[PDB]
Amino acid sequence: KQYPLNVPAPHHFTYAVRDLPEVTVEQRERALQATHYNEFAFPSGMLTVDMLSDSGTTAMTNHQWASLFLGDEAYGRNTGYYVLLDTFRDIFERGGEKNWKKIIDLVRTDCRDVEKMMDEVYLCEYEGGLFNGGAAQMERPNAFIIQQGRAAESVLMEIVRNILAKRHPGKKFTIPSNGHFDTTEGNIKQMGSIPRNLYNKTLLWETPEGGRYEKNPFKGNMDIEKLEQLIQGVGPENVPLIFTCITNNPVCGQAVSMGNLKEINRVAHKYNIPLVFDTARWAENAYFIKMNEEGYADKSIAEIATEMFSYCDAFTMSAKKDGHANMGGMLAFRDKGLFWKNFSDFNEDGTVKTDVGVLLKVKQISCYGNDSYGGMSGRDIMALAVGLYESCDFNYMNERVAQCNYLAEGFYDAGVKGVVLPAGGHAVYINMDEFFDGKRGHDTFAGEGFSLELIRRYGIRVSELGDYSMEYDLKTPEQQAEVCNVVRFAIDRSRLTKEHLDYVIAAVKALYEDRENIPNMRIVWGHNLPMRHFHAFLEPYANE
Amino acid sequence: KQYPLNVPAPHHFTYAVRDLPEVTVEQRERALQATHYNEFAFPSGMLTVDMLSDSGTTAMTNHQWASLFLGDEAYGRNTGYYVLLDTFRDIFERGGEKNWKKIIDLVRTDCRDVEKMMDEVYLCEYEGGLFNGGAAQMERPNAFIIQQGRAAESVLMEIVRNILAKRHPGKKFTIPSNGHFDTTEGNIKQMGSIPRNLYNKTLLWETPEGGRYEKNPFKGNMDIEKLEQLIQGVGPENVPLIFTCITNNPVCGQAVSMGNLKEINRVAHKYNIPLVFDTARWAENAYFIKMNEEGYADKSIAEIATEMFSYCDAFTMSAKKDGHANMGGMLAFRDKGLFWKNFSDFNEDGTVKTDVGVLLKVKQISCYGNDSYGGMSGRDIMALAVGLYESCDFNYMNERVAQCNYLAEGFYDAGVKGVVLPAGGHAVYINMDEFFDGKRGHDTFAGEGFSLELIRRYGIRVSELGDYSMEYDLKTPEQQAEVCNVVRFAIDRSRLTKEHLDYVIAAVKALYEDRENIPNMRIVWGHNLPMRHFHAFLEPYAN
Amino acid sequence: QYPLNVPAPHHFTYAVRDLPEVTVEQRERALQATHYNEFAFPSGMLTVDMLSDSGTTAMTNHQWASLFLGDEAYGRNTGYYVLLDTFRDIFERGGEKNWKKIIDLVRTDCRDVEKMMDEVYLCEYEGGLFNGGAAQMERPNAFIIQQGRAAESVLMEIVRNILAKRHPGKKFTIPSNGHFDTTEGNIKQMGSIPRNLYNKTLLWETPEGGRYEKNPFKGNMDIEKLEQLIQGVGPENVPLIFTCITNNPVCGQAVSMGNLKEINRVAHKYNIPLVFDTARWAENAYFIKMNEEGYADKSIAEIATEMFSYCDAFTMSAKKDGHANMGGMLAFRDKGLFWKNFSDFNEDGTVKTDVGVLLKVKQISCYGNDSYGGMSGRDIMALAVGLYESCDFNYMNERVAQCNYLAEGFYDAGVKGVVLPAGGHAVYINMDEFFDGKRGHDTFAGEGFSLELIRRYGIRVSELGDYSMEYDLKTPEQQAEVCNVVRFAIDRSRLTKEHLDYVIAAVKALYEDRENIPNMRIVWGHNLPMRHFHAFLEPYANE
Amino acid sequence: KNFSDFNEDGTVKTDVGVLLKVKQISCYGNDSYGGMSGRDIMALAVGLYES
Ligand SMILES: Cc1ncc(COP(=O)(O)O)c(/C=N/[C@@H](C[C@@]2(Cl)C(=O)Nc3ccccc32)C(=O)O)c1O
Numbered sequence A: 001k002q003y004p005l006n007v008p009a010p011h012h013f014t015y016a017v018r019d020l021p022e023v024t025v026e027q028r029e030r031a032l033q034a035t036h037y038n039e040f041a042f043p044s045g046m047l048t049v050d051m052l053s054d055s056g057t058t059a060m061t062n063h064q065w066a067s068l069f070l071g072d073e074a075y076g077r078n079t080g081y082y083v084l085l086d087t088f089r090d091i092f093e094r095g096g097e098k099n100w101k102k103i104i105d106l107v108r109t110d111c112r113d114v115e116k117m118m119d120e121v122y123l124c125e126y127e128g129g130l131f132n133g134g135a136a137q138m139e140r141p142n143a144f145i146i147q148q149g150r151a152a153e154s155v156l157m158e159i160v161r162n163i164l165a166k167r168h169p170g171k172k173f174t175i176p177s178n179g180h181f182d183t184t185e186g187n188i189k190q191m192g193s194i195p196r197n198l199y200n201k202t203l204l205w206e207t208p209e210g211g212r213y214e215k216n217p218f219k220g221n222m223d224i225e226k227l228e229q230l231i232q233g234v235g236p237e238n239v240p241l242i243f244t245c246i247t248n249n250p251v252c253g254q255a256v257s258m259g260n261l262k263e264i265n266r267v268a269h270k271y272n273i274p275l276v277f278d279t280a281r282w283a284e285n286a287y288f289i290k291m292n293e294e295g296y297a298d299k300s301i302a303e304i305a306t307e308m309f310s311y312c313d314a315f316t317m318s319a320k321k322d323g324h325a326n327m328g329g330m331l332a333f334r335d336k337g338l339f340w341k342n343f344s345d346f347n348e349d350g351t352v353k354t355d356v357g358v359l360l361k362v363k364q365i366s367c368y369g370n371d372s373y374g375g376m377s378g379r380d381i382m383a384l385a386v387g388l389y390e391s392c393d394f395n396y397m398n399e400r401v402a403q404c405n406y407l408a409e410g411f412y413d414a415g416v417k418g419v420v421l422p423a424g425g426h427a428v429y430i431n432m433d434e435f436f437d438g439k440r441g442h443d444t445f446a447g448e449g450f451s452l453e454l455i456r457r458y459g460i461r462v463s464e465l466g467d468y469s470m471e472y473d474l475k476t477p478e479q480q481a482e483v484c485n486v487v488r489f490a491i492d493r494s495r496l497t498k499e500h501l502d503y504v505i506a507a508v509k510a511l512y513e514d515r516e517n518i519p520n521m522r523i524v525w526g527h528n529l530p531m532r533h534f535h536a537f538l539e540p541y542a543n544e
Numbered sequence B: 001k002q003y004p005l006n007v008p009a010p011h012h013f014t015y016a017v018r019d020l021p022e023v024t025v026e027q028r029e030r031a032l033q034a035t036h037y038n039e040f041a042f043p044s045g046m047l048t049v050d051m052l053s054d055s056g057t058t059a060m061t062n063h064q065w066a067s068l069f070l071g072d073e074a075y076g077r078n079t080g081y082y083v084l085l086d087t088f089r090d091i092f093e094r095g096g097e098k099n100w101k102k103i104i105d106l107v108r109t110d111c112r113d114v115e116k117m118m119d120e121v122y123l124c125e126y127e128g129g130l131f132n133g134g135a136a137q138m139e140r141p142n143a144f145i146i147q148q149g150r151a152a153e154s155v156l157m158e159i160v161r162n163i164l165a166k167r168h169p170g171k172k173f174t175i176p177s178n179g180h181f182d183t184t185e186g187n188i189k190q191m192g193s194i195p196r197n198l199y200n201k202t203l204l205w206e207t208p209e210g211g212r213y214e215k216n217p218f219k220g221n222m223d224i225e226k227l228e229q230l231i232q233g234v235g236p237e238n239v240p241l242i243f244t245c246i247t248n249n250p251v252c253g254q255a256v257s258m259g260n261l262k263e264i265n266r267v268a269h270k271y272n273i274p275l276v277f278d279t280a281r282w283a284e285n286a287y288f289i290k291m292n293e294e295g296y297a298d299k300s301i302a303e304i305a306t307e308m309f310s311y312c313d314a315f316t317m318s319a320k321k322d323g324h325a326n327m328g329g330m331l332a333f334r335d336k337g338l339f340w341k342n343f344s345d346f347n348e349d350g351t352v353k354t355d356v357g358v359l360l361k362v363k364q365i366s367c368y369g370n371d372s373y374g375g376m377s378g379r380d381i382m383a384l385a386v387g388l389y390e391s392c393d394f395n396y397m398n399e400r401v402a403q404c405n406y407l408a409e410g411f412y413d414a415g416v417k418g419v420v421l422p423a424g425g426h427a428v429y430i431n432m433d434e435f436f437d438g439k440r441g442h443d444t445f446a447g448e449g450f451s452l453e454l455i456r457r458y459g460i461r462v463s464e465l466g467d468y469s470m471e472y473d474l475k476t477p478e479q480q481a482e483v484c485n486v487v488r489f490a491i492d493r494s495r496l497t498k499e500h501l502d503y504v505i506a507a508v509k510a511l512y513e514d515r516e517n518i519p520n521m522r523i524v525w526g527h528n529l530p531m532r533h534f535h536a537f538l539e540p541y542a543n
Numbered sequence C: 001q002y003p004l005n006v007p008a009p010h011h012f013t014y015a016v017r018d019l020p021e022v023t024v025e026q027r028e029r030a031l032q033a034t035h036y037n038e039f040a041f042p043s044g045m046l047t048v049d050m051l052s053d054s055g056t057t058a059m060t061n062h063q064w065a066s067l068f069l070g071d072e073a074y075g076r077n078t079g080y081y082v083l084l085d086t087f088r089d090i091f092e093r094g095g096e097k098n099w100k101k102i103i104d105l106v107r108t109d110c111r112d113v114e115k116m117m118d119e120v121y122l123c124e125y126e127g128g129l130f131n132g133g134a135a136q137m138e139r140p141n142a143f144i145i146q147q148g149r150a151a152e153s154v155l156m157e158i159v160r161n162i163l164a165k166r167h168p169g170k171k172f173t174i175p176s177n178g179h180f181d182t183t184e185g186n187i188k189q190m191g192s193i194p195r196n197l198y199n200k201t202l203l204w205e206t207p208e209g210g211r212y213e214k215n216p217f218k219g220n221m222d223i224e225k226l227e228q229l230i231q232g233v234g235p236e237n238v239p240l241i242f243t244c245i246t247n248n249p250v251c252g253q254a255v256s257m258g259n260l261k262e263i264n265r266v267a268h269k270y271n272i273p274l275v276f277d278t279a280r281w282a283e284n285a286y287f288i289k290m291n292e293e294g295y296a297d298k299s300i301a302e303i304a305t306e307m308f309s310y311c312d313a314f315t316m317s318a319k320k321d322g323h324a325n326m327g328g329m330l331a332f333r334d335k336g337l338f339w340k341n342f343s344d345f346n347e348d349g350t351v352k353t354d355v356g357v358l359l360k361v362k363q364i365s366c367y368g369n370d371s372y373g374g375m376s377g378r379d380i381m382a383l384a385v386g387l388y389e390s391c392d393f394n395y396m397n398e399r400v401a402q403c404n405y406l407a408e409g410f411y412d413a414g415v416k417g418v419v420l421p422a423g424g425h426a427v428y429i430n431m432d433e434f435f436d437g438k439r440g441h442d443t444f445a446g447e448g449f450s451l452e453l454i455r456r457y458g459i460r461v462s463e464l465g466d467y468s469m470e471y472d473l474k475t476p477e478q479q480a481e482v483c484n485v486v487r488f489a490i491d492r493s494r495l496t497k498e499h500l501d502y503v504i505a506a507v508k509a510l511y512e513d514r515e516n517i518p519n520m521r522i523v524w525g526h527n528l529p530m531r532h533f534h535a536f537l538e539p540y541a542n543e
Numbered sequence D: 001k002n003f004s005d006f007n008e009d010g011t012v013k014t015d016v017g018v019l020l021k022v023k024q025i026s027c028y029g030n031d032s033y034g035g036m037s038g039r040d041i042m043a044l045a046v047g048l049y050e051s
């Protein structure tokens, strides 16, 4: 029996609330100058809608809050370490809710059977996949809990550099990807390697009839020709790792398809090159696949998640995104997989001599913390495990992405030009070139003035992720052609509602209609710093 | 500098979230019949939008959740006892934020000066108002913490009934109000007393041009003429108390102006009749006064709240409403005021013989709990104190009532017949005589069939507060003329967003366009029970 | 007054957690299944876990209340300002009388935005350890980070890059009163040479009765040895001088203020920046206040500001004396000695490369934004509350009393090798005096002691002797500073006398059976950096 | 049996349970929570197992 309506039934409600401050325009002018016009230095408690980053900003579910009280703060082998690892196993290896072990439920039900705990939690042995356990994790470490994504990439990048520097001193390598985001690209350039972003920058800027594609075209896909012309061009022996980002955050958070991941796997393994996933927004990407890629409409997000991860030899993850949590990170690689083969040292008789996993662990434990908590508190570790399961839920993710489509189609319906469609899984992007109608030069940095104008006028903070923040003027010509000149409106998970989005639409429309009066922005300090958009001082000036 | 927009800035955001269930129509229909078609017995774990009641259903603020951990669970004199009493003093006696002592901040800042805590919290003396403190509260007790409003009313009504029985055995008294609710009225008929609702039932149904009153007309006001005509018709000696509800919950949660309060106070004290306020929705009312009544536009909720309460001799409050909380109640009377003079007994020389405040305290402690917690946990007492300060915040209350305005205008702009206007401060009401175009009877109980259809089809729960749940059939002809045949959509404080509201608007519009399909309901068990909507069994037949 | 021999209690249990019911055989199985690595043993199976006091604290109710005030914004969450200014209060403002406690504005829910800009967001501070506002942007000298090893690792990395693009090849020496295995491991992995300069003869001294009259401050750095090594190796080859308070390597032993002053003078004598590791500052301050002359009237907070005046830079693991489960901090004096030696300047004289900026680029690219530095927003708030709790004399006086009670319980029970007096966080036993000379350095019998505590009694402790400090992997000079002790670290606020009585009895029994404690053989990872977190062991009987 | 009233044929006329429920609901709270907060209910349920 059906009683349909032209509006959907909500699937969550506000469990607890938090008030927003009352701030004048004039007060936000004082704070802007007082902080050198750096978005990252503007006070949070002076804002009305904060869309700076979806990283760590989530509103937890009531079950996550409950779980804080189940966290274990012991220094060695706190119980959440086992629970976290087997939650990764559940979502990314087991394949389907019907296959989950959900040992988190032994902690949630206050199990007091020590024997059962031993046999199903503490002493379980796993080998052969992304997450060893028991003595196998001790003998062949391959999973590394850490505070966040950049810490996971940096522990990884350092090890790779050390090893490469020993085997090929003074040689620099090219590490391509579909989209290296500022953290990853900056940590790469800092290691000495050359990053490259291979995608179809042409499809990116097409917008569909009526404003809404009928199917999502997966604009985050890696161009497979470009990837193989790059490998044959510079030499495969010069390409030590291949990266893929899911979803593609640099390329306007656009989805990446399962067939695309299968191609990257083919090309990469063709040349014996380990393939590393950046999987911060794994669950948004799984959702786009289910909703758009033929054959995947009746598989679950948990199913698609395991399948996507079958194609990688390693991955880095900031769980502060689709962990639906406020902290967490993870680095893992296939047990005795392609990444472990190339980067370990072997004896003549075939036995391992230097395990890359041991080198990684040594760095983890000297720079971040014991492997059992990775620089997280015990309670954050339990809330993260719960949060990762929440991201598997269709109705939650359906509403999470419905919010992005609403903001983008709002920007469109209101006559804002240069709105990238469809929306990414976490954010809506605006092409600043089409926005100012090509009346500003790549060194105007007007996209930065647009962002500071949102703050000054409306208490809305966004993130310029184009020429200025991607360091257009400090890159090579090929890298310059790979820059998307876009401003980003990121949507915190579970924290905002239609009323926040309607106000942002109204305010963007107003700023559009007054775009001539948006200033340009001049760097007055830090123009050359690594990842300068976190450090540099700015100064506005009018256009001429 | 101003940068105007045609959309208001948001004033809060979601701190934490809870998921709603995935439920079929077949599943809800199965549960409706397993539970005899009583909406209070329907499992809330199966609802999509629950609008049964705003009482206790609030999403707390994060500062309230923090206060929980500051709660003191001791049996005698928990610190929360003092904090809560003095929070009542700040809001209802001290006249404005600038006059608040906010001793809750000594708890919040972990003050460890025993001397300072002694002088500013534990040992303070207060007398002469609604909340005695220290030795005064022991000698002349006049404030009683208790877990909710119906408990606050019951203690008062029992002690009033006992005093009236011993002094006037056999006399049946009349007690008027602008509107007594099902619990209040039911608790008064259970004494054997005659409750009466004196309001302008004609003003009530007036729909305004366009559906937007330029100013709130205060349809909750008591009819002063009708009040005098009742005091003189029954004789002052037969009116031992005068009640006044703010907002007027029974009369479509309609606003009550401050001039009205001044008048009721005058008429009452002309006859030496103590005036008791039901103040569950004080802060929504203070907002309506500020936004609509001449000369108060520049006054804060908190100022207006002190001024309202100055016109009363006692009050009962269910703090589960405008206390932004999930539990809490309060009963108080002015120290040595008119309520204490007419209900205490004195010696020949005029000193007190039997103190009515002691008679309520003995009842409080023997049936509810010690006067330092009154049936509440210690953490709930702290969270209540924080919550009552939050209800004074203009922007919070301005956005709370906006939701109700939004939902009623939604109903109107969709062409549903019977939307009372303006909306309540907590709920929107629909007149079911106007919904069905006069095509259903007072015994068809079509209002219950509507509320239950909302559940079956849409997983929306509402409260029929009309003929059935007000026992129109079990009332005197005089009282049947004051019965409002309306269904109520109550909005939980801070829990719902626009998304929830648009869904309800859509669902009601669809059911309005399917009026004839809404079955009738026939009570099959109960009917002659006090407050029978909370327990009666029901069954549907076609019209 | 009415004295009693029994002290009065100064805290109680706010909430409880149950412990597991486990058998010897279950524990023996888990030990074999986890290679006999004490860090791989499941905490879920333990009765009393004394592996580490770091991050294992039971928070106060006010800290738990704190968690709900944490701000999870990416850019400049409010907790960033509150935490910085808590460091200013405790470590720069010289006593409670001069604190600002801006955390109280958060805890009382300040909604006056101008007040918040002028007292929190836009404050300017320069000239000390914690710049604020544009100063902290222009000359960054404070860095929030998840824990101490991340702090020292960001220092030591930046120093290494400088000392190499300046003195290529050269290998420098970094003295300290006692570098911990974390600091030493990181120094050694940087290429430099750690060295710990203290009086090992004093350390083993016993007081007649097992109770000293005044703490002899055996963690003090040997003033003579320091100038001998600086003159020996040459000033230009000592780039930094560390100092640990309390001295964790040297049995968590207290360090006097006089000694900090002396180390200050010798260090500027040759223009060497002085760098304090202050993980356990509060207990060191408490040892000063009770033992040095003319400090008995000074409170913890005054002594903490004073101690900190003598450093040019500090690293801190707030997971210890911050009464918290996560948190670290790196800081240095604004335009101070450390900033002068390690920045690069123009001929004009302006800074050319600010060492502060280099540290910030590292922090931001490898840990997290400087506004949260890899911490969640609620852990920032709770850390700020916890640092204030560590200044309270009654807390810190019951905390250290649990160590005295444990060491003196061992002594009273005939156990031999108990270092004295107890440290501020733990009790240390010398394994040589324990086994009465009858075990060799290569026997690792201390690790057999620790593992046997697990097997029979569910007690986990840590070996910090010739196995974990890597005796056989060090120069002989380094080998003589190695302390052969097993540590009993006492979690802050988590345990009670009942737990200690049981560890006391369990150690007495296992001392009386020390003839039967196995020796430990490293089967794998004998050479790994910080091998006690990695290595595999196997038990073997003693011959 | 003792405190309810019964009809001639044998069936209940005045059920004592119903009388107790009317008093519960008019003086303390709905039977669903009886004057307790929702969270106090759940923590009580956990508490009783613990005992
Ligand atoms: C694909 C991908 N890979 C790795 C990481 C690092 O993970 P982690 O260490 O932070 O947890 C991220 C994190 N992205 C963030 C947060 C942050 Cl500073 C940032 O990192 N870049 C940036 C740009 C503009 C505003 C704010 C930010 C975001 O999307 O806004 C990522 O998107």
Ligand SMILES: Cc1ncc(COP(=O)(O)O)c(/C=N/[C@@H](C[C@@]2(Cl)C(=O)Nc3ccccc32)C(=O)O)c1O
Binding pocket: B052, B053, B054, B055, B147, B148, B149, B150, B151, B181, B182, B183, B184, B245, B249, B278, B280, B318, B319, B320, B463, B465, B490, D029, D030
């Ligand atoms: C003005 C006023 N004064 C005192 C009290 C007593 O307070 P308390 O004991 O419950 O805390 C209340 C109670 N209000 C509730 C709950 C309840 Cl059963 C009811 O009483 N009437 C009603 C109508 C429809 C659905 C459910 C209900 C509510 O408004 O929905 C009140 O409205």
Ligand SMILES: Cc1ncc(COP(=O)(O)O)c(/C=N/[C@@H](C[C@@]2(Cl)C(=O)Nc3ccccc32)C(=O)O)c1O
Binding pocket: A075, A369, C051, C052, C053, C054, C147, C148, C149, C150, C180, C181, C182, C183, C244, C248, C277, C279, C317, C318, C319, C328, C462, C489
């Ligand atoms: C003076 C000083 N400087 C830096 C740090 C690092 O701080 P952080 O990064 O861990 O937060 C510490 C902390 N020491 C800890 C943690 C640790 Cl691994 C250890 O170092 N030795 C050991 C032995 C058994 C269990 C755990 C441990 C402790 O002894 O309890 C310190 O005392």
